[PDB]
């Protein structure tokens, strides 16, 4: 069984989000479903609940702008929220919460960024290790992912083969209103001349992927 949120991404202030929750491995009318959101760094906020009986119940704050419905033929439940403001930026989750039932099902969530800015893909620069180590048997290297919008970017190393010692920092909002982050990894200093290190940067909002080989300088 799976739940997958679709829609979302960049939305303009004053507009609406239309989020769909598609079920796979079971029927959507078999359980009731909630919509939950979480603004970046903040707590969980319940939006509304659609019973398996089809009736919608909303948290008081959300009743005036939110409509939750389901389409059995598509196997989906849908959240509509109009009159969006910056404060509506959040990861939106569809979930069977299972507070008293043994069955709980969650989606991965989808980030909705409420902004009038345009999408911008990242520039990717190496954070190169020295050929001759200056830090013992363990060297650091990475990739600077600069000037993108909206979030998120994801970074993997060697297409997922390298995960140990990786730190992908939270994005920082720059004074330009564009994001930047670095992803770094520590590796054996002896491996530099022999092991290849490639950062795989994906910025799905701009349908852009960058693969950058990071070589000693």
């Amino acid at each position: 069984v799976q739940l997958v949120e679709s829609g979302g991404g960049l939305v303009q202030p004053g507009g609406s989000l239309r989020l769909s929750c598609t079920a796979s491995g079971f029927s959507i009318d078999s359980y009731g479903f909630s919509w939950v959101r979480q603004a970046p760094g903040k707590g969980l906020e319940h939006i509304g609940y659609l019973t398996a009986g089809g009736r919608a119940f909303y948290a008081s704050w959300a009743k005036s702008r939110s409509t939750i419905t389901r389409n059995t033929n598509e196997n989906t439940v849908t959240l509509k929220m109009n009159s969006l403001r910056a404060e509506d930026t959040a990861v939106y989750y569809c979930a069977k919460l299972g507070s008293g039932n043994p069955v709980a099902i969650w989606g991965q969530g989808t980030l909705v960024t409420v902004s009038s800015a345009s999408t911008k893909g990242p520039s990717v620069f190496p954070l190169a290790p020295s050929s001759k180590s200056t830090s013992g048997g363990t060297a650091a290297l990475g990739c600077l992912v600069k000037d993108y919008f909206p979030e998120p970017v994801t970074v993997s190393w060697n297409s997922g083969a390298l995960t140990s010692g990786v730190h992908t920092f939270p994005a920082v909002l720059q004074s330009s209103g564009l994001y930047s982050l670095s992803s770094v990894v520590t590796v054996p200093s002896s491996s530099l001349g022999t092991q290849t290190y490639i950062c795989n940067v994906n910025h799905k909002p701009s349908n852009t992927k960058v693969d950058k080989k990071v070589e000693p300088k």
């Binding site: 319940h46 919460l97 730190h167 920092f169 670095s182």
Partner: protein, 218 residues
């Protein structure tokens, strides 16, 4: 209007400690039954640990247990482990003829206390590719340290910098409970090429460590 009042808002505990998190329901929980506990780790969706007050999901370790009597609901971690770093939330459901509502607790941020660990400090010059485009990002990395508090200062030809750097910090590591931190100094290409010595100075307690490079030298 149904509310779950969760305490403490945060706590610091050592590996092996017993942790108790409490949630007070503003009313009878559906049928004094619809309370669950969720655990959210950095970057992930919330994961349900406990349902129906005290039933442990089979994918969750037995170190976690839920209890409830009256309006008090309690999550107990019997022997805290490093991987338990997370924010924990209670959730309650309330039913009625014309009412089907959920309320989340505000969350409890569980931090792992551990021994002091000095950062490994690395400094990275801007790439030649970035410099061609007109900007210079200089990156200082503080890797795998504890506690979180560290003062990072930039010096350019021995002049203390102010207002031209930003920091980012990771969440506590799920295996060794350390932090890592980046400080990024941003200069125009023109300003970068007017100076030679770039240094990041990292102070924790009685120790200051400075890592430096000379522009163009390697």
């Amino acid at each position: 209007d149904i509310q779950m009042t969760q305490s403490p808002s945060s706590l610091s505990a050592s590996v092996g400690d017993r942790v108790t998190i409490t949630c007070r329901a503003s009313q009878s929980v559906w049928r004094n039954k619809n309370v669950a506990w969720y655990q959210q780790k950095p970057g992930k969706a919330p994961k349900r640990l406990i349902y129906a007050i005290a039933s442990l999901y089979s994918g969750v370790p037995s170190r976690f247990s839920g209890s409830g009597s009256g309006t008090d609901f309690t999550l107990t971690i019997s022997s805290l482990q490093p991987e338990d770093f997370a924010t924990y939330y209670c959730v309650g459901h309330y039913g009625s003829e014309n009412d089907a509502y959920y309320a989340f607790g505000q969350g409890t941020k569980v931090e792992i206390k551990r021994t002091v660990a000095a950062p490994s400090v690395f400094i990275f010059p801007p790439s030649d590719e970035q410099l061609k485009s007109g900007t210079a990002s200089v990156v200082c990395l503080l890797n795998n340290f504890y506690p979180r508090e560290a003062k990072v200062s930039w010096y350019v030809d021995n002049a203390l910098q102010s207002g031209n750097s930003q920091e980012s910090v990771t969440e506590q590591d799920s295996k060794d409970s350390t932090y890592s931190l980046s400080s990024t100094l941003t200069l125009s290409k023109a300003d970068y090429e007017k100076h030679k010595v770039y240094a990041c100075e990292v102070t924790q307690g009685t120790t200051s460590v400075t890592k430096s490079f000379n522009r163009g030298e390697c």
